[PDB]
Design a protein around this ligand. Structure first.
Ligand SMILES: CC(C)(C)NC(=O)N[C@H](C(=O)N1C[C@H]2[C@@H]([C@H]1C(=O)N[C@H](C=N)C[C@@H]1CCNC1=O)C2(C)C)C(C)(C)C
Ligand SMILES: CC(C)(C)NC(=O)N[C@H](C(=O)N1C[C@H]2[C@@H]([C@H]1C(=O)N[C@H](C=N)C[C@@H]1CCNC1=O)C2(C)C)C(C)(C)C
Lengths: 305, 305
């Protein structure tokens, strides 16, 4: 037992991280087969990033201007193109450590692991959620761009995020691996605003099931509610509407614990209306919304990769 | 910016994880060069674990009784011995993925990453602290034993923990890699008690520096204190004494922020005496003590491996 914010093992992704340098700018790239994927603002000076014309800056680069390094080994670049906000650098060597992989675009509310990197080298791994406003709460410094987020399923790495930029209050924004931003953001150093964030209701419920599985049961009340009445109450506390799709997804945890989802909603309703009264749940004084239902099952059942 | 509970990249350790099976019991082992290290209770039946004589049970095992599997490949066992609570299984094949490594015994208050494994396969990675009562707050299920905790320094993996057992309230206990338990525990399924835990004062201060670095400054007051007066106040809140060694270790963060350690102690003193008044620090409603000073610098300066 015990319940921790757990990240995927990062070895498969570590074997794909490289360093990309164009002129004076160095960031991280992802090397899969014979292609290196990286953020397009590697081609920028600091001055360009205030208002870049990426197509124009790329036209004046040639293959040899991109210095790509896997550890202590330069990879020779033999073609290049831009896809949305990422560059694809074709190299003359296929990465022998390439995992089975997919590129996926995740949904708000879903979680993934981030391998933060600098100069092509891994610094650490942590778990994030795609917030409803399409930002993530990450930990990123200068040079971290090109770091990727991912999930693993058996042997298959699903890449879903590449890091590009930071927003007020330590908030981060990036693209999927086709270079399309999550959220209404562009890769330009100019004022842009995130939408209001909201709490991921289905993840709070998953985490309350994790608490019950761990023996933290004090918050279970004797009541049920309707889905409609729960959503009226949760709305003023800035919680996402709970849909029937969410209820079905919570099925395995509900069936395992013997606690109907709507009965857990009645307990959450009371927590939202009355507070915690100075108690904790799984050691936390705040309700937690960055564990999906699958995260809870994965951790409490010991799924491996 | 941003501050997350960050684990070390686990790839180097993933390449060392194997499965060990003796009779009906399967757990994890660590394969370095031509030796597999694993917990000795792999040689137990469930009944033996109530009161095992490990020396006696080991005498009736021979090399061939240990089934060691690296992925889909059986490693042939060619010798065996017991060192304290771990077994060393000598195999006929050196692990070609062996990192540069060391075995170290960590101190209470220090942190490390855990790669939780089942059947020799990684499930997830998270960061833990060795509590002052020599337990850790982990996430471990049946079959997780042999999972290891570690730190990385440049290229060198320092292994410091191997998992053996669970204590009341989701608390975990294990050994260093010479098989010596942390704390007053034995590997026997019989009542044993942990000591009272206390809060790691120097880590709380490190985390408050991380908060300042991140712009969360509301708790800084205008006061200083003496080391003696701080420790009198912290004692009734079940905080560890802060020593001059701790103050020196906090030097880099103090010098970086321009906040004398004893000035930060005066701020912590006020938090302990007055509470948070409904505010958070780095998103948390509780003071956090599982980041060391080096963890803070590593994250906020982007150290890589
Ligand atoms: C106003 C608005 C809300 C839009 N915000 C910003 O302007 N934000 C900027 C930013 O992020 N950038 C400016 C420039 C880069 C991108 C960039 O520097 N990315 C780093 C990659 N290595 C990752 C950063 C570095 C700091 N922490 C990270 O996460 C591009 C092309 C947008 C700054 C101010 C944080 C530098
Ligand atoms: C009373 C006391 C405080 C001493 N506690 C226990 O008895 N605790 C026991 C326990 O842990 N064990 C009993 C038996 C094993 C060791 C063991 O089952 N280890 C698992 C390795 N794969 C890891 C466990 C499995 C559950 N979660 C883990 O962490 C040995 C030899 C001590 C039980 C009750 C949790 C099973």
């Amino acid at each position: 037992s015990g319940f921790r914010k757990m990240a995927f093992p990062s070895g498969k992704v570590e074997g794909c991280m490289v360093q990309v340098t164009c002129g004076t700018t160095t960031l991280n790239g992802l090397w899969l087969d014979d292609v290196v994927y990286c953020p397009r603002h590697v081609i920028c000076t600091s001055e360009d990033m205030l208002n870049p014309n990426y197509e124009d800056l790329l036209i004046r680069k040639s293959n040899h201007n991109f210095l790509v390094q896997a550890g202590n080994v330069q990879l020779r670049v033999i073609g290049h193109s831009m896809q949305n906000c990422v560059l694809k650098l074709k190299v003359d060597t296929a990465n022998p450590k390439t995992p089975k992989y997919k590129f996926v675009r995740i949904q708000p509310g879903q979680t993934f692991s981030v391998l933060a990197c600098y100069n092509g080298s891994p610094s650490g791994v942590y778990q994030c959620a795609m917030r409803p406003n399409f930002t993530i709460k990450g930990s990123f410094l200068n040079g971290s761009c090109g770091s990727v987020g991912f999930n693993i399923d058996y042997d298959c790495v699903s890449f879903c995020y590449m890091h590009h930029m930071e927003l007020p209050t330590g908030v981060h924004a990036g693209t999927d691996l086709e270079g399309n931003f999550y959220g209404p953001f562009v890769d330009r150093q100019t004022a842009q605003a995130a939408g209001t964030d909201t709490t991921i209701t289905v993840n709070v419920l998953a985490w309350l099931y994790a608490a019950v599985i761990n023996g933290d049961r004090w918050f279970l009340n004797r009541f049920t509610t309707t889905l409609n009445d729960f959503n009226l109450v949760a709305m003023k506390y800035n919680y996402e509407p709970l849909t029937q799709d969410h209820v079905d997804i919570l099925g395995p945890l509900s069936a395992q614990t013997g606690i109907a989802v709507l009965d857990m909603c009645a307990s959450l309703k009371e927590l939202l209306q009355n507070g915690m009264n100075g108690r904790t749940i799984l050691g936390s004084a705040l309700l937690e919304d960055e564990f999906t239902p699958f995260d809870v099952v994965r951790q409490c059942s010991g799924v491996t990769f």
